[PDB]
Amino acid sequence: NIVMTQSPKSMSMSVGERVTLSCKASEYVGTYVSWYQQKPEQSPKLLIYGASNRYTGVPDRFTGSGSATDFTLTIGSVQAEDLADYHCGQSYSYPTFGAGTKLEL
Amino acid sequence: DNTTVFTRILDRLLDGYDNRLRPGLGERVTEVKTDIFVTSFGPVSDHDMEYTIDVFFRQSWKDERLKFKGPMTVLRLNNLMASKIWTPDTFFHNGKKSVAHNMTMPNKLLRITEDGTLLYTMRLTVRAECPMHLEDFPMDAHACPLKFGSYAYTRAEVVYEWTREPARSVVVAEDGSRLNQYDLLGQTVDSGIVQSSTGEYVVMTTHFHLKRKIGYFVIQTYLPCIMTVILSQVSFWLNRESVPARTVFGVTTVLTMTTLSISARNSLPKVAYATAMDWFIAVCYAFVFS
Amino acid sequence: TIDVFFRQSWKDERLKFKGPMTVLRLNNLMASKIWTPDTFFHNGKKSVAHNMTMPNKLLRITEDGTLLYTMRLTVRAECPMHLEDFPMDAHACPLKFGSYAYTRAEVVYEWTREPARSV
Amino acid sequence: LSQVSFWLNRESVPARTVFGVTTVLTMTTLSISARNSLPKVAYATAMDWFIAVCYAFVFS
Amino acid sequence: SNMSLVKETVDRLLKGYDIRLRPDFGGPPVAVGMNIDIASIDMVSEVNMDYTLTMYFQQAWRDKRLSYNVIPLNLTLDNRVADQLWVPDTYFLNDKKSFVHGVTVKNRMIRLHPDGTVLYGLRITTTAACMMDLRRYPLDEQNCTLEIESYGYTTDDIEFYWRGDDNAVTGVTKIELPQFSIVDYKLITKKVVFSTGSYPRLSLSFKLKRNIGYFILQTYMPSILITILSWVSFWINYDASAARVALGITTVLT
Amino acid sequence: VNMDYTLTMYFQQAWRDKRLSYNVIPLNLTLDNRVADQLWVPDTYFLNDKKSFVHGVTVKNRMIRLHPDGTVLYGLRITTTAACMMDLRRYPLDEQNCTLEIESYGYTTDDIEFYWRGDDNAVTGVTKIELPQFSIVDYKLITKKVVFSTGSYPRLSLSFKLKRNIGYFILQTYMPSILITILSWVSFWINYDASAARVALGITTVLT
Amino acid sequence: GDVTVILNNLLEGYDNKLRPDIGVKPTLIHTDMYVNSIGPVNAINMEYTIDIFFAQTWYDRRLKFNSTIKVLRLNSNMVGKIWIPDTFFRNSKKADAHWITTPNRMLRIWNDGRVLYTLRLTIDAECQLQLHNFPMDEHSCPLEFSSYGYPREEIVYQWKRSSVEVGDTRSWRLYQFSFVGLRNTTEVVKTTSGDYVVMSVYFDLSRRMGYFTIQTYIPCTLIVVLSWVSFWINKDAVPARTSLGITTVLTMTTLSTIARKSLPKVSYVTAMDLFVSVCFIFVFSALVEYGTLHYFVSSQPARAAKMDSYARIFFPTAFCLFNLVYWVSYLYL
Ligand SMILES: *[C@@H]1O[C@H](CO)[C@@H](O[C@@H]2O[C@H](CO)[C@@H](O[C@@H]3O[C@H](CO[C@H]4O[C@H](CO[C@H]5O[C@H](CO)[C@@H](O)[C@H](O)[C@@H]5O[C@H]5O[C@H](CO)[C@@H](O)[C@H](O)[C@@H]5O)[C@@H](O)[C@H](O[C@H]5O[C@H](CO)[C@@H](O)[C@H](O)[C@@H]5O)[C@@H]4O)[C@@H](O)[C@H](O[C@H]4O[C@H](CO)[C@@H](O)[C@H](O)[C@@H]4O[C@H]4O[C@H](CO)[C@@H](O)[C@H](O)[C@@H]4O[C@H]4O[C@H](CO)[C@@H](O)[C@H](O)[C@@H]4O)[C@@H]3O)[C@H](O)[C@H]2NC(C)=O)[C@H](O)[C@H]1NC(C)=O
Ligand SMILES: *[C@@H]1O[C@H](CO)[C@@H](O[C@@H]2O[C@H](CO)[C@@H](O[C@@H]3O[C@H](CO[C@H]4O[C@H](CO)[C@@H](O)[C@H](O)[C@@H]4O)[C@@H](O)[C@H](O[C@H]4O[C@H](CO)[C@@H](O)[C@H](O)[C@@H]4O)[C@@H]3O)[C@H](O)[C@H]2NC(C)=O)[C@H](O)[C@H]1NC(C)=O
Ligand SMILES: *[C@@H]1O[C@H](CO)[C@@H](O[C@@H]2O[C@H](CO)[C@@H](O[C@@H]3O[C@H](CO[C@H]4O[C@H](CO)[C@@H](O)[C@H](O)[C@@H]4O)[C@@H](O)[C@H](O[C@H]4O[C@H](CO)[C@@H](O)[C@H](O)[C@@H]4O)[C@@H]3O)[C@H](O)[C@H]2NC(C)=O)[C@H](O)[C@H]1NC(C)=O
Ligand SMILES: *[C@@H]1O[C@H](CO)[C@@H](O[C@@H]2O[C@H](CO)[C@@H](O[C@@H]3O[C@H](CO[C@H]4O[C@H](CO)[C@@H](O)[C@H](O)[C@@H]4O)[C@@H](O)[C@H](O[C@H]4O[C@H](CO)[C@@H](O)[C@H](O)[C@@H]4O)[C@@H]3O)[C@H](O)[C@H]2NC(C)=O)[C@H](O)[C@H]1NC(C)=O
Numbered sequence A: 001n002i003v004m005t006q007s008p009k010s011m012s013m014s015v016g017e018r019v020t021l022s023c024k025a026s027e028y029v030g031t032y033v034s035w036y037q038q039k040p041e042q043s044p045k046l047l048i049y050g051a052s053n054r055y056t057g058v059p060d061r062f063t064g065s066g067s068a069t070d071f072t073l074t075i076g077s078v079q080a081e082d083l084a085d086y087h088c089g090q091s092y093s094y095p096t097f098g099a100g101t102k103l104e105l
Numbered sequence B: 001d002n003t004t005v006f007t008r009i010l011d012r013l014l015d016g017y018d019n020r021l022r023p024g025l026g027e028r029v030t031e032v033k034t035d036i037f038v039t040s041f042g043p044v045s046d047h048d049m050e051y052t053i054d055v056f057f058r059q060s061w062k063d064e065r066l067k068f069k070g071p072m073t074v075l076r077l078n079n080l081m082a083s084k085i086w087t088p089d090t091f092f093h094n095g096k097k098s099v100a101h102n103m104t105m106p107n108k109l110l111r112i113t114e115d116g117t118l119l120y121t122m123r124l125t126v127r128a129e130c131p132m133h134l135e136d137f138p139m140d141a142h143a144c145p146l147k148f149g150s151y152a153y154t155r156a157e158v159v160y161e162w163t164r165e166p167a168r169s170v171v172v173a174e175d176g177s178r179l180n181q182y183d184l185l186g187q188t189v190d191s192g193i194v195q196s197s198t199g200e201y202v203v204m205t206t207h208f209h210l211k212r213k214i215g216y217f218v219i220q221t222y223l224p225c226i227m228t229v230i231l232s233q234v235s236f237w238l239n240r241e242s243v244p245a246r247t248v249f250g251v252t253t254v255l256t257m258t259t260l261s262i263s264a265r266n267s268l269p270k271v272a273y274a275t276a277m278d279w280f281i282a283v284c285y286a287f288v289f290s
Numbered sequence C: 001t002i003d004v005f006f007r008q009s010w011k012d013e014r015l016k017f018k019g020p021m022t023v024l025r026l027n028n029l030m031a032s033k034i035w036t037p038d039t040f041f042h043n044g045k046k047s048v049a050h051n052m053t054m055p056n057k058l059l060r061i062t063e064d065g066t067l068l069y070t071m072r073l074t075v076r077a078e079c080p081m082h083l084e085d086f087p088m089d090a091h092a093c094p095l096k097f098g099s100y101a102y103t104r105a106e107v108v109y110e111w112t113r114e115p116a117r118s119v
Numbered sequence D: 001l002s003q004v005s006f007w008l009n010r011e012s013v014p015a016r017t018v019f020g021v022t023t024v025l026t027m028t029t030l031s032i033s034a035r036n037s038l039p040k041v042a043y044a045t046a047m048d049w050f051i052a053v054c055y056a057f058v059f060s
Numbered sequence E: 001s002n003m004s005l006v007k008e009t010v011d012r013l014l015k016g017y018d019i020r021l022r023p024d025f026g027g028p029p030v031a032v033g034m035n036i037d038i039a040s041i042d043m044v045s046e047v048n049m050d051y052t053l054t055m056y057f058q059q060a061w062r063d064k065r066l067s068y069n070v071i072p073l074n075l076t077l078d079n080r081v082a083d084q085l086w087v088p089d090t091y092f093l094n095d096k097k098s099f100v101h102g103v104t105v106k107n108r109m110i111r112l113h114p115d116g117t118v119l120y121g122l123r124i125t126t127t128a129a130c131m132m133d134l135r136r137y138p139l140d141e142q143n144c145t146l147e148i149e150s151y152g153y154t155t156d157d158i159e160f161y162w163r164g165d166d167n168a169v170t171g172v173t174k175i176e177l178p179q180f181s182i183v184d185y186k187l188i189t190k191k192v193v194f195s196t197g198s199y200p201r202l203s204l205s206f207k208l209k210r211n212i213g214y215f216i217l218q219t220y221m222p223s224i225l226i227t228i229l230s231w232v233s234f235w236i237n238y239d240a241s242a243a244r245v246a247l248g249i250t251t252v253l254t
Numbered sequence F: 001v002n003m004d005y006t007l008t009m010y011f012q013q014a015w016r017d018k019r020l021s022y023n024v025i026p027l028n029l030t031l032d033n034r035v036a037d038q039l040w041v042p043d044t045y046f047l048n049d050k051k052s053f054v055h056g057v058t059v060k061n062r063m064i065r066l067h068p069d070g071t072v073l074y075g076l077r078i079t080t081t082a083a084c085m086m087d088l089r090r091y092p093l094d095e096q097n098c099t100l101e102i103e104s105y106g107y108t109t110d111d112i113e114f115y116w117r118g119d120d121n122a123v124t125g126v127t128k129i130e131l132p133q134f135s136i137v138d139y140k141l142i143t144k145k146v147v148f149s150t151g152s153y154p155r156l157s158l159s160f161k162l163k164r165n166i167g168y169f170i171l172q173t174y175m176p177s178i179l180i181t182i183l184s185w186v187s188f189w190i191n192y193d194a195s196a197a198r199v200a201l202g203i204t205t206v207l208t
Numbered sequence G: 001g002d003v004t005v006i007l008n009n010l011l012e013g014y015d016n017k018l019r020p021d022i023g024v025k026p027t028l029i030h031t032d033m034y035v036n037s038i039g040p041v042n043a044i045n046m047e048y049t050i051d052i053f054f055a056q057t058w059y060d061r062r063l064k065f066n067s068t069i070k071v072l073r074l075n076s077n078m079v080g081k082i083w084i085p086d087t088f089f090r091n092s093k094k095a096d097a098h099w100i101t102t103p104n105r106m107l108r109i110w111n112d113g114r115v116l117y118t119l120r121l122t123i124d125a126e127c128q129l130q131l132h133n134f135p136m137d138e139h140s141c142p143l144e145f146s147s148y149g150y151p152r153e154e155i156v157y158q159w160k161r162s163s164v165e166v167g168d169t170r171s172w173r174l175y176q177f178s179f180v181g182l183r184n185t186t187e188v189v190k191t192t193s194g195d196y197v198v199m200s201v202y203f204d205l206s207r208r209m210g211y212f213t214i215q216t217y218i219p220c221t222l223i224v225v226l227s228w229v230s231f232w233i234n235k236d237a238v239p240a241r242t243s244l245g246i247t248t249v250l251t252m253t254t255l256s257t258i259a260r261k262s263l264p265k266v267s268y269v270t271a272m273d274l275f276v277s278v279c280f281i282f283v284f285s286a287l288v289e290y291g292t293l294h295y296f297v298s299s300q301p302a303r304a305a306k307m308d309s310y311a312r313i314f315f316p317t318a319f320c321l322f323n324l325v326y327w328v329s330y331l332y333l
């Protein structure tokens, strides 16, 4: 399939700082990667579609970038409600998801 | 009178129908699902930096004004029904000249499902512009694009989407290769947005990756150049007491090199830089002259 | 090859009018609804009438019923050359036009100005 | 160039032979090319006569 | 008067005719029979990998709507009525550029028969793509073909077949090509599957063999003759360096 | 050889028609292009074009967009083969200036007025044009009135200044002839006792 | 005024889908042709161009009126409203009417219902040129036309007494060929559609051998005499004579390539390439003769000495003899 290597496995940052999550695609996926926020005991929520397109209801601090194999999700000035898991997936081919990334303080 | 009831269905379907207005004109964005079947990948014109392509261009959208109920679930209609309804005004951005085939009739297709979904397929040939960088010619590779989208409808009105998984939405037929000088390694698709002077438009892109075959140029330029170099160097083994013979060798080899150098470029466009073939011919000319 | 504005002018009494304008600078599609001369080029091979971005035509009706009708053409015409003195040769390339379908008892052509100033 | 050959000494045979041969070949090429530019008229033009006379001089 | 009878018959046939529906719209497929009279095969080009043929392309089908029993004659109509009747959406898949001849009028025919049989002919010139294997050129054989298919109507809407099944195509033996000889030709009936359904297809294909004599004269002979003139150098004494080198170099140049 | 260039452009026209004014709908109506056959459009033409067309796949590549005040935005994707008379006295070290003349065929200057929307940014995409043999050095927009026997007409001129790249010609014709002249000079280093050799050099050089 | 009334009455209740006398008798059409010019005849595509005025006349009892006006002289406006025969040209690769400034068409309707319908046409007509005896080749190739959908029972064409008229022939575009006459013919052909009356006009064209003379014959014979020149050069000058012969050969092959490139790629032998091949054989003979002479110098001097003089006479005599045979056989054919 297409392997989405998402790094780091986990990371912690206080409230107010900028973070950059990164996702690596095995093959070419164009701009067909989406970012998902999954808070504990909840279903995933789409944040970024395309590669840089904020889904409706997504605050303006979340923002995605990248094309081809390299992608990133920068959360500028994280708040206290940004603690969750963050999954990257590709929809270029039959979907595959990254292993995930946990965000603590 | 099954034809009569179907005629009554069709007439009730177009009553009070304004084909000037897209479905969901002021209250929704029209979503056109798109699919391409490549029946042949025409030749690549290096001189013109273009390539020809034959396709079935398939477009599907939903028109709520075209719902119907009858003894069929789909209506396979003659292609003159498409002119009576709204259809997307898709065009190829880097298209140079394309043709919508109409022998013996307009090579078109219109299926209406009873829920109002439409399938609209065309057969058409596209001459598209493929910008090429020939620094590594004749050992170069290119990604020739095919970009399409809506004319006159911005992202807020019509958006385009691949009907199936993006990686499976452009399909090339097995026997459909009209490539003489190139090899079709594969295809890639993408979607994006272009800001024009009239607004923000969705653009769908396909890249066809072509690798040039070196064989023709080997036989026609590289082997002759190596042969002339060998012949020029064979003159060393002649006796020094034969000035006319070695003079003939030198002059005729130089003349052959000049003819070959004039011949080689004639196949490529008149670019302003030196290709790999140009460097090879230059070194061969240097050896003959030396 | 020759690119021309081809101007024709005739009187049609049926097109007299009386209004605020002395002349009606009319669109190129009004001409299709009225009689126009069927001029053609006797030695023309393959001519084109331009309709980019619209038909390159012109119709102007004066109140007295005089019509002006001009069109933009590219005319390709046969010029039979006698190449005995080539390349020191001079030629007279003709351009003959007249009415298909109307004999001299029905339609005649004249130059609009002095003949020496009409081309 | 053909007339230059008259100033070479009578001993340099291959030199004068090359002059004559190459000049005639050049004239034949020059004749074909000059006929290329024209419609395939069936008569002779002024250029044809000039070429024919120059060829006659080279042959002579 | 028989003119009035024909006029009323044609008016009745064309009244209430829905061009948007094929014959037997909801019922079984309509069967279209194909005839081809090949006028010529024009330019077999290796450079463009294609060829041009002109043919009288004829199609025949039953349309019960266009049936009449008041007059005993087959009605040939002005070919403008073809724009008012349903005709099949036949297209040639591999053709690169085509037209119907239009002098002095559009060269098409439309003939009605009392039982409803329509006869619809077209004089067509198609430039059809034909990929040629030139590995054995000029001692090569080429197999080109014209692919005939329905565009909109799948195989449960329409059926294609050759009328005669072997005499459906005529005029092949009369074709003379400057460089090729027609070895033979075949007629194939099949169905092809696409993502949008399965469609009827007819294939007409020709086997073309290239003539050798032209190539012999123009390119083979000179090669042997230059090789023999190069051999002539062996009968020249080794003392004559200029002569032998001129011979060899000039042969290489030729 | 043909003294002409081919350009493809998106040609936009804007005017106001009080007849097409509406106030019940608040937004701008993008209509199916086929309605342009039912509206007045200016009779614009290109005086120097030889052959041109509007692209027609999948449909005719034209745009019609109305505004509540009545403004009409009319757009076409055109390819024109404009005549480009070139002076080749300095070929291939030559700089060429050919243009596109835009004029109203039937409407004199008291019926219609042409202007460049922007008047300096009215033309876009020029800096992104890549010609293999030339480079667009400069372009200009002009507004004129031209006088014919039938009246005086608004005219807009778009001009391009093309500088020809020379590298191709260095590779193709300049270097070979220079090298052939160097070859010619070798004759003077060969003993003047040899007639066949020196004549071979000279004749071969001339013919090359 | 009342011509409008006549026209409106003629067209009212009129069906142009039905030929006159639909179910009574065949429609008889008399055809005339005025040939403006017969264009170039390119053997590469085996086609020729022709520009004509094509006149057709027939009777339509529906177009019958009674008035002081005897003839209605009309333009193309009314052509599409009446029945027109569907005449097409059978051997035309392509054809077109003329449309500048208006359709070059004419319609005249007489009192008794006679219709005359004329239009201007340029046609690229196919004809298969048997290029044996080229460039001394004469051809008579046709222009055929018939009805597309109407068999003999429905439409019959008929040549008038003075049906085909040509113009001056001085302003035509025939360079390789000269027009020498014509003839008209009628016949019936059988097709899958039915039996059709087919009309034919044959134009007789003879090639004029003035371009090919100076393009191929003079250069080839001059190259041959240049080859002869070798027989007078001193036998000791080996490089001179070798180069003379071999250069003659390469010039011969270039000339052969061009000459054959004149015409289409036909596998049979034309008269021109037989001449070129014989010239090549002559040049090859001169070169091999010098080679053998030089070889025999080392063995036998007298042999080579007399061989030179023998060749000096046997070559030109053979060439003159071949010229006589060739021209006698081909010119008197
Ligand atoms: C695949 O798709 C292709 C592309 O769509 C398609 O090709 C198109 O086919 C159609 C139909 O077959 C063509 O339309 C016909 O064209 C005929 C003319 O053909 C010549 O000219 C056209 C261009 O037409 C211009 O010129 C004529 C006359 O000069 C005008 O009448 C046209 O309106 C048009 O003029 C406009 O454009 C000009 C600029 O060019 C402007 O200057 C001008 O002001 C106008 O704006 C060419 O394209 C043709 O070339 C093509 O075809 C030839 C065929 O041999 C090829 O060789 C060539 O390579 C090209 O392929 C050709 O040169 C028209 O005559 C015709 O219209 C008449 O007939 C129809 C049907 O009968 C009528 O409905 C119509 O009303 C017209 O009849 C009226 O006029 C005639 C005139 O004689 C009268 O006799 C008649 O009684 C009737 O009169 C009535 O109306 C009059 C007003 O019009 C009025 O005065 C009377 O009083 C009365 O009321 C028809 O339009 C179209 O051109 C083709 N396009 C192309 C690009 O090829 C192809 O077929 C498709 N294939 C398949 C298999 O489906
Ligand atoms: C130019 O090039 C074209 C393209 O290659 C050639 O066209 C081919 O012509 C051959 C000969 O007619 C075709 O071969 C035929 O295929 C049919 C389909 O076979 C399938 O179906 C049958 C049952 O329907 C199965 O038996 C089979 O396993 C396949 O699944 C066969 O039905 C034909 O007959 C075969 O079966 C019968 C009965 O068993 C035997 O008696 C026959 O001997 C034969 O075995 C036949 O095999 C081929 O399909 C064509 N190709 C294409 C792409 O259509 C032209 O021939 C070539 N030259 C010319 C001059 O045209
Ligand atoms: C040079 O440039 C000019 C202008 O750019 C071109 O003129 C256009 O020509 C096209 C084709 O002839 C015209 O389109 C035609 O419109 C006709 C009328 O449409 C109106 O009126 C009818 C009522 O009769 C209404 O139904 C309709 O809603 C419009 O309000 C139609 O008669 C034509 O229909 C034909 O095609 C349709 C396609 O669906 C079929 O349904 C019909 O059966 C018929 O076959 C056609 O739609 C267009 O209007 C012209 N423009 C203008 C401004 O008049 C020239 O054609 C061009 N010259 C060349 C050679 O290209
Ligand atoms: C490519 O080729 C084209 C065509 O040759 C060139 O286009 C020309 O461009 C120049 C300048 O851009 C144009 O010259 C301009 O003419 C205007 C109108 O002239 C009127 O006034 C003068 C007197 O001032 C009269 O003699 C004349 O008859 C007219 O009545 C001037 O207004 C322009 O400005 C001039 O005056 C102002 C006054 O403030 C000065 O500041 C300016 O510096 C200047 O002196 C200017 O003179 C010329 O008309 C264009 N040609 C055509 C045919 O229109 C392109 O420039 C060329 N290059 C490129 C890159 O395309």
Ligand SMILES: *[C@@H]1O[C@H](CO)[C@@H](O[C@@H]2O[C@H](CO)[C@@H](O)[C@H](O)[C@H]2NC(C)=O)[C@H](O)[C@H]1NC(C)=O
Residues within 6 Å of the ligand: F026, F027, F028, F067
């Ligand atoms: C219709 O188009 C007009 C002009 O293109 C739009 O008016 C513009 O609105 C934007 C957004 O507020 C402003 O930046 C411009 O100043 C306006 N221009 C003009 C000329 O008024 C209008 O908003 C569009 N209609 C809709 C519904 O968006």
Ligand SMILES: *[C@@H]1O[C@H](CO)[C@@H](O[C@@H]2O[C@H](CO)[C@@H](O)[C@H](O)[C@H]2NC(C)=O)[C@H](O)[C@H]1NC(C)=O
Residues within 6 Å of the ligand: G159, G160, G161, G162, G163, G182, G183, G184
């Ligand atoms: C054209 O055809 C007409 C009729 O088919 C030929 O005219 C006939 O000529 C012969 C003399 O050979 C007369 O006896 C007949 O009376 C003529 N018939 C008519 C109806 O006039 C005419 O010869 C043909 N033109 C040719 C062959 O050039």
Ligand SMILES: Cc1ccc(-n2c(-c3ccccc3)nc3ccccc3c2=O)cc1
Residues within 6 Å of the ligand: B219, B220, B223, B224, B225, B227, B228, B256
């Ligand atoms: C078909 C074909 C293609 C190329 C060649 N050719 C070969 C050459 C190179 C390799 C093997 C045999 C000949 N050397 C040359 C040397 C100098 C000038 C031209 C050639 C040449 O044109 C001959 C025939």
